[PDB]
Symmetry: D2
Subunit: 305 residues, 4 copies
Amino acid sequence: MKITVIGAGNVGATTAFRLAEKQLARELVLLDVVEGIPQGKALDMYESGPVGLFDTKVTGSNDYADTANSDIVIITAGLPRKPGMTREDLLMKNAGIVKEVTDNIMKHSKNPIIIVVSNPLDIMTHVAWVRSGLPKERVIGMAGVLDAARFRSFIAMELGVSMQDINACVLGGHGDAMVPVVKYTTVAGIPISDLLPAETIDKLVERTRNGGAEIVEHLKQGSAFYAPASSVVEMVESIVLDRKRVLPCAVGLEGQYGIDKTFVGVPVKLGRNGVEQIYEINLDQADLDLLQKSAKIVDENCKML
Amino acid sequence: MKITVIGAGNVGATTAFRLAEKQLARELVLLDVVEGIPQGKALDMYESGPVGLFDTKVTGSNDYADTANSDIVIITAGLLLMKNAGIVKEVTDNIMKHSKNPIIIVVSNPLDIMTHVAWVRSGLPKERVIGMAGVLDAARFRSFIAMELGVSMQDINACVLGGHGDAMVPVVKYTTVAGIPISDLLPAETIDKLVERTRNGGAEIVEHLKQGSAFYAPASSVVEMVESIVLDRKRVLPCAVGLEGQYGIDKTFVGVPVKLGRNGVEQIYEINLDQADLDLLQKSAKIVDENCKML
Amino acid sequence: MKITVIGAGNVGATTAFRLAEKQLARELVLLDVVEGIPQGKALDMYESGPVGLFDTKVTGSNDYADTANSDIVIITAGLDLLMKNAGIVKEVTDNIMKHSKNPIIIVVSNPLDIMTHVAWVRSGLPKERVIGMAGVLDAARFRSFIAMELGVSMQDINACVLGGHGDAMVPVVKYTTVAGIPISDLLPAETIDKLVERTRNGGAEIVEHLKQGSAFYAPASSVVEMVESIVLDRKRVLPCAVGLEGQYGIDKTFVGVPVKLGRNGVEQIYEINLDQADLDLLQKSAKIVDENCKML
Amino acid sequence: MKITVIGAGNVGATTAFRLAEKQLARELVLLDVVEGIPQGKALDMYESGPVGLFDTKVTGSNDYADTANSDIVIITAGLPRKPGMTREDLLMKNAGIVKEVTDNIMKHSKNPIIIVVSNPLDIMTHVAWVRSGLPKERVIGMAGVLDAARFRSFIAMELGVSMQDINACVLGGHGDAMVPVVKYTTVAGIPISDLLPAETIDKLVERTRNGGAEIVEHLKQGSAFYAPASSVVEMVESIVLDRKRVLPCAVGLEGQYGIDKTFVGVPVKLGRNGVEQIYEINLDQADLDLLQKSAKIVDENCKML
Ligand SMILES: NC(=O)c1ccc[n+]([C@@H]2O[C@H](COP(=O)([O-])OP(=O)(O)OC[C@H]3O[C@@H](n4cnc5c(N)ncnc54)[C@H](O)[C@@H]3O)[C@@H](O)[C@H]2O)c1
Ligand SMILES: NC(=O)c1ccc[n+]([C@@H]2O[C@H](COP(=O)([O-])OP(=O)(O)OC[C@H]3O[C@@H](n4cnc5c(N)ncnc54)[C@H](O)[C@@H]3O)[C@@H](O)[C@H]2O)c1
Ligand SMILES: NC(=O)c1ccc[n+]([C@@H]2O[C@H](COP(=O)([O-])OP(=O)(O)OC[C@H]3O[C@@H](n4cnc5c(N)ncnc54)[C@H](O)[C@@H]3O)[C@@H](O)[C@H]2O)c1
Ligand SMILES: NC(=O)c1ccc[n+]([C@@H]2O[C@H](COP(=O)([O-])OP(=O)(O)OC[C@H]3O[C@@H](n4cnc5c(N)ncnc54)[C@H](O)[C@@H]3O)[C@@H](O)[C@H]2O)c1
């Protein structure tokens, strides 16, 4: 198992390190455009192996040749969104980044599984997909796991119960595009609406909606990376160990939810072959409406490309 | 078990995060002098819990009141001797105002010297104030040998005494692969380079990073020490501790093998060093000693 | 942290070994009434330490003095079945209390609900510190069968199971899900019924295969999950056997319900909204558990 | 990765369970001749996955068809030295068991790595090897790791130091055939001769020599299985994760230590290809003599087979 992580920033490096430690791959390549950084971090990670008890070969590079024949490729290239940036501005920029990166990895890696993390997630996962030339089942984006994670931690603070016993159902994208399904959000199998007032739930849902902005507001510069990295790894783990986890990821639909082709966040079974099954849950009218509406917006922006 | 990490920078946050998922403490508090950074990083970590499967209560803060009654305090605060000494001095006086008997692990460079500063400020028995350094050097020495011989790092033991760089004293006779001395597996010339690369290991990362320093190995090294103490494992690890004669060195803090348990330093090991290594070790001790004097 | 495991049999030893590796205690004492068995198994476990990378001090013994001041004590001692095991749990508990003043006691010995009650009254401890393992295991089985049916990770399946073992077991279907999705949404009524039934007879299914003895790997893992919540103060919400004081219309009786496990033991008892059939099933059982206890 | 464990007894089952939890294989098969036991134990293991957090498909069987195409096969079949068995008697019985099993697995698996645990180890590993018809590099036995593990635990009790910082060099076989190399037995790199008196060291070496008997002495019936299981898994892990661990194992030599084709316990580097390197350590005259001497014993026993 060989894994390549494109982008040696906060999210890419944190992800590479976690992957190295869990020994999910014998070879891990950390690539970036800037010379130095990937070489440095990768070496720093490897040098921790004596203590972490892992022999994962972690190397840094600036040459896509080193990524040759990767079984899985994680794209975290780009840059968050400096304060004051425009939606369309970031879209064009990152669309370029993701396209360049994707064309490059396909030049040295055929049939890999691509996991996209770059923002705007839904569109970028689409972009990566179209450039990859692979079946949609091999290109997936990380977003829902992270939103579900924040949602769960907030519910945990509210009730004082372990986060391991909380399920948060989150479909769609981020911000107004996020579609949290309170109906399938449980605590030990019990729906949260059975336990908490609608008013409290609304607050938890909104904090989840702007969860990233909350981190940003504290860090002053940059953005969240521990939860995002952990989330990326959970997906990578299901694929490497063929666990068949059911996680909300950005995948290309083909009819489900009255949506076609567009990349939308939905519960899917992840295995060694990528998206092995897409679940179409019984959303309420409003949620299903928001989901179709947001997917339509994505469809538009994808034409702008 | 309540652990407090001072300094929410690269090593401190990386450490707190590893600490959080290993569930070595029920309460973990990240403190920094800058507002927002610790609160933000701590939240990011906590939000990782649903996925990392841990419930550790990680909180960020700028108020030492939140560090009250800490069992272990890790000081990673710092930007050199003069500036970090003031920082370590300020941090130590603050933690002691809210924690009466913690075990303090210092990582702020210059290590041996800073460890000494924290020790004197804390007013604690030297068995409860140690510095991290040797574990990291040993880890680097180990990864290089692993690259050289193509074997698992888990089966390599690297003995490293002294401080960093020139003051570092790797003991070749006690450096092995599956119990076999390296001088039995490699040309004395290759052993010299591996040794030198270990001496300049920290600078090798810096050069690559261009900004800041290494933190993944340093963080992992710190946690191994924390774990031995928390789980009372009695690991034998080289750390910076106050000597009382061993190696012909007294008072000064120096990197030597020690048995780490729930009570901190429960034993200092004095290994038979040859003339060359003992000379170096002592030489460095006096250097560390002059600096502490001028402080 | 000092944990004592009573009964060095299949469940007790498997539990001790798991505990030793996870390093949830500095001291782990395996005690049995049979000479040599615990000493041997504990030594074998300790010798695994260089490989499992743990330094947990696991020791075997036939002397309760070695269990002194234990924070947590796990009772797996047991070989009519009601009377014999009741005698054993009685003897074990009284012995435990002569050397430990305030431990958290986790009972595993069958018949669970009842043995948990026995241990509780003999211990003289607050009921929040005496619990029995049962629901976690039934739920684990219920979850493993669903995974076989749907081909999904067991980590994303939540099975709600209240009550005791066998016909006393009350699996709540509406609170059993896959990624938050009710199984009734994913499986036919018939398939769900068979899975529920296989869960009811889960224990006998293993026994039938082993001829002698019963399951121990899932039972041990289940116990450890409970111990971990307490040791690490995780506040997990797990179905365990505990003494009720009105919840579900049941009083005094020990029965399996969801509880919040923390460093202080049972920190909260959850009373979920059961449908009429399940609520009556739960109450029926509890009354049976209550009769047996009265006769003891 | 598919792994088969022949024998559902204490060491076989304990090994299967550990393998399942570590997720070292997506498929684990437990086979035995007795109907029931393997099915029951295997089901019990799988039913713990919801709690152990693994999805390893663990199945029990009495049909070698199920072991089809196993990447690794672990032989733990047998039932050695009763309270008065003959070294000869045990040798013949287990020799037939190991061959019957090896022939069976080769009919359903063509290029699997075989790891033997059945006693007498060195001899049974030789048997399995000849039958398998595979290169000697893919047939190894477990013995040195266990003796080394015991040796370390004893040194730990003696000095009050973590077992993780103790290295124990043990070559050869068990009992009289065991060749502990005090010279390469360390604590944080320090030779134990630098730390303990020759008198204490000898006591430690002899306890290691009769370590299995000490367990038997307490259990009254059967024998050790936790340490043995853990040892087998450490080897399996190095192979699966291609860690390149250096562990004392029973492998077919080809010259080193002045020993030819016989299986002897020596430090070897284990990777995905099995025995990737045999280390010939600088033993002292006495130890070197014991090694060749015992090796001869083995040759004599294999001859009359
Ligand atoms: N999926 C989510 O919900 C989620 C969560 C967090 C962050 N993100 C997004 O992930 C990205 C990375 O976040 P970060 O915090 O790690 O950022 P960062 O700025 O720390 O790191 C990005 C890295 O990308 C590299 N890079 C830029 N252009 C490149 C190119 N053409 N090729 C190769 N490498 C290139 C940079 O040099 C940099 O090291 C951002 O776009 C951010 O908005 C998404
Ligand atoms: N012991 C070793 O072998 C070793 C290895 C690596 C780094 N280090 C040292 O550790 C320190 C931290 O390294 P880093 O990479 O994390 O640095 P960094 O620059 O990323 O972070 C340092 C953090 O300290 C904080 N800080 C400064 N003054 C403070 C004060 N008075 N109180 C509380 N917080 C304060 C900053 O605001 C910053 O967030 C440095 O001194 C470095 O040289 C030692
Ligand atoms: N709660 C559950 O869901 C669950 C699951 C599995 C097993 N169990 C029950 O747990 C018990 C143990 O199961 P097992 O498979 O380990 O059995 P086992 O027969 O393997 O072991 C029982 C051990 O108890 C010891 N013992 C007997 N009397 C004792 C006494 N007075 N004091 C101390 N030790 C004594 C024996 O000597 C023996 O080593 C049984 O009663 C069984 O039915 C309950
Ligand atoms: N390598 C070491 O240092 C070491 C350590 C411990 C045990 N061992 C050896 O490992 C073996 C197993 O130990 P155990 O404690 O698990 O014993 P055990 O008696 O509990 O189990 C042996 C299992 O082998 C099965 N079996 C017998 N003949 C078989 C055949 N032809 N095919 C398939 N299965 C068969 C039995 O039915 C039984 O379940 C013994 O030979 C023992 O001496 C070696």
